[PDB]
Design a protein around this ligand. Structure first.
Ligand SMILES: [Zn+2]
Length: 74
């Protein structure tokens, strides 16, 4: 249903701290929180991503992994 930068930011309320990637960027790319520790998923393509490194661009990786996503255009 709802898949904006605000609704996707509301799923990052129970997200574990200490993560090396800003929640905004994660939601900006088109991912949200599913509940699993460090577990996001695309809203258009629905790609799951976790265990990120330091300074990793969510958008870049998203297009580098699933470039067929309709929300990966922007
Ligand atoms: Zn996607």
């Amino acid at each position: 249903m709802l898949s904006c930068e605000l609704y996707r930011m509301s799923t990052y309320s129970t997200f574990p701290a200490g993560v090396p990637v800003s929640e905004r960027s994660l939601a900006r790319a088109g991912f949200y929180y599913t509940g699993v520790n460090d577990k996001v998923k695309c809203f258009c393509c629905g790609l799951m991503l976790d265990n990120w490194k330091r300074g990793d661009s969510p958008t870049e990786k998203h297009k580098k992994l699933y470039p067929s996503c309709r929300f990966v255009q922007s």
